[PDB]
RNA sequence: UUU
C-alpha cells in the first residue's frame, strides 16, 4: 500500500533524527530536548522539518507510525516523542568510520549518496557542507558506516572502478 | 535544516 510505505517512512526518519549518529551531530534538536530535561519533545516540532513536510502534515498519523520502533516512545497521549534510551558519549571511533568522498555535481543530494553506498553497508550518516553566507556545495561528502569494516569496504571502491 |  502507499500508505504502508509513508508510515513505514515516517518510521525511517525518526528512527533517524533521534538515532544515535544525528543526534551526536545536530544541535538544535539536542537543545530541545536537554531544554525540557524530561526528554520528549512534541511531534508539532517534527512537523515544522523539511523532510517531514514531504510526508505528512498530520501528527496523529506520524503516532501511529512509531507504535513499532527500537528507539523513540510516546507516553499519554501520542504528542510527544523521547529517545527510549539514554544518549551519552560521542563515539570516537566515528572518524575510523565516517568516509571523505568527492562527488560529481549538483549536489547529487542524499538519495544518489545511499544507493551508491548502501552497496557496502549500513549507511548511518551522510554530509552534505554547505558554505555559510553564500549555501553553495563545497563539492565533497561524508558517509558514516556503521562497523569500521563497512567503512573499508567504501574506501575500497575508492580504488575500484 | 536530513535541524
Redesign the pocket.
Known sequence: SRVKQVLADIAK?VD??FGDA?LHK????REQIEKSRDGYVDISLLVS????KKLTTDGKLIARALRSSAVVELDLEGTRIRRKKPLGERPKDEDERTVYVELLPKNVN?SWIERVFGKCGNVV????P?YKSTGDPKGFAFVEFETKEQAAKAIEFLNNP
Request: no cysteine; aromatic share 28%; charged share 15%.
Open positions: 526518519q533517524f533524527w544525528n545536530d544541535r538544535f534538536l522539518f523539511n523532510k517531514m542524499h550518516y551522510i554530509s552534505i554547505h
